[PDB]
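Objective 1b of the project was to move from sequence-level analysis to a structural picture of ligand recognition. The entry below was assembled by the postdoctoral researcher (A.K.) and checked by the PI before modelling. It contains the amino acid sequence of the target and the SMILES of the bound compound, 5-[2-(1H-pyrrol-1-yl)ethoxy]-1H-indole.
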Amino acid sequence: VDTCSLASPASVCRTKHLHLRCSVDFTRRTLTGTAALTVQSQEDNLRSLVLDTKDLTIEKVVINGQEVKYALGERQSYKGSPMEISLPIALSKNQEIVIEISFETSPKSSALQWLTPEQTSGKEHPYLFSQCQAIHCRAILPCQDTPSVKLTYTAEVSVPKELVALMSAIRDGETPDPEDPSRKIYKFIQKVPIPCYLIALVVGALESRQIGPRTLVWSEKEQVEKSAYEFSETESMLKIAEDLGGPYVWGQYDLLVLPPSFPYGGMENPCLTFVTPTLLAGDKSLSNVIAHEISHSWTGNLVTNKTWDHFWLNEGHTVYLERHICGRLFGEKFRHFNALGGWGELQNSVKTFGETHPFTKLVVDLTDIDPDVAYSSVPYEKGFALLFYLEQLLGGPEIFLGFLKAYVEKFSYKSITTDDWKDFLYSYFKDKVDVLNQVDWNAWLYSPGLPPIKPNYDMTLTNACIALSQRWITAKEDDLNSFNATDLKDLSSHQLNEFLAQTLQRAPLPLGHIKRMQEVYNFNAINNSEIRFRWLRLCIQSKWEDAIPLALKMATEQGRMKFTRPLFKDLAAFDKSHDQAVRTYQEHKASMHPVTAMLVGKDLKV
Ligand SMILES: c1ccn(CCOc2ccc3[nH]ccc3c2)c1
Ligand SMILES: [Yb+3]
Ligand SMILES: [Zn+2]
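Corresponding predicted holo structure:
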């Protein structure tokens, strides 16, 4: 049961294919066109079915060349409105028909952000991008908006001729639009069956540069050269991922670097990963995000969570593979360092939510819960900790990687639950079932709070970070003079970040200590977004008014929710900046991403 979807479930009917024919209207901020769904009955005598929609205007529904009856039910909040379609002839089991729906989206579509020219790099043209995960595809087109259903798709997208459209699919040509010579039609094909949350579209002034045998980077012209360098490890990571996961089946692996309001670090859209431009550190230091998105090409896009209650299957396994890729590139001690950092992020989330909160369970129950509200580090890092614990229990990384590749092979092109995963784990490790029975499954999978057992972590790269954090924390005023730029001499950017993460866990520190830290380390000069984020949080939580305009600037000049949400919350919690924090949100909200605007407003109680 997919409690996030109002559509007929997969046991009743299933979409096999979507043919999308649409036009992007920047004057009206609407997409208008037809969604032709090829649907296969799973029941005898099927006479109706229901699709998910959200803020869509339906013009008509056509089957066998005739208009048919349909009805839109009452809106159910963030789930949207169910659309019931009256089939003209009762279908037998396995029979397939094509249902062609004429629709138009709303400018407030929660799947979409429409940007004016001023919100782009080039300042001449507008830009549109989508983000369907988890349940926003219904705000673009009517569909069974559940990851329990997989479908292929084709699309034809008409756009102003000076712009470029891309989708999560192989590019299948471009022509002038016969209905309007001021336009171009871009065509697409996704021959591999996917869940509809992986449908993606961007329209803008995009240019491309090849950076590997199967990878172009796409962005506005101003970002191309920098993106090419930043993500140059992409091919080497794909080769390692193929070694761990089996064949890459999607053809191309292209990258799209979005404008700064993109809400996530990345989105694993097939053939075309979307990334934040906050990855552009200049030194490739945030490339774990690329490794993560690459890994989703197996865990998530091939083996998929059957409902969003089982999101940890997607995310936990992906973090596990991510950390292996980075460990192959940079060493097993670095994999452990990153693993242990992730446990720290899990501590933070559990402390933030509260150790008994339902969203700290590994498997969650999203009945009446908006996935965007529930979203956190938990499925990522509690899922990873479980897998890392199991790795250690069952004989080490070589052995557990054998399981992972067998698991991907077994469930490719399928959608699964936590029970499916656990059943297969027991089947694969049939000779170690004694050891598996030692795991407290009920606590790991279903209980809130920190896991019942913490894995073992190599400390080599972490010790210097803890040591320095502890010096600052225990320092008194007469110790502040001993600190100096040389303290950071032998620390990588990853280690500087972890030093800040350790210190932030003990915040506030005294204002004088934070002033000294800027004096000796000049953190204000660091443009690395992960570093700058934690530094500004530490400054604001420690009540440094000088940091207020810096934090406001970072919160608004980009929109990755990982950074924007906690910066606004911190600024709201500081009495000196509270009124400005809400004013700034109020002023910006109309031009923010619709999901980000929603969540920041809830965070700020405005
Ligand atoms: C990374 C890139 C896009 N997203 C969208 C958020 O999606 C989800 C999906 C599934 C979820 N289960 C619980 C919260 C939750 C949130 C997260
Ligand atoms: Yb002293
Ligand atoms: Zn992910």
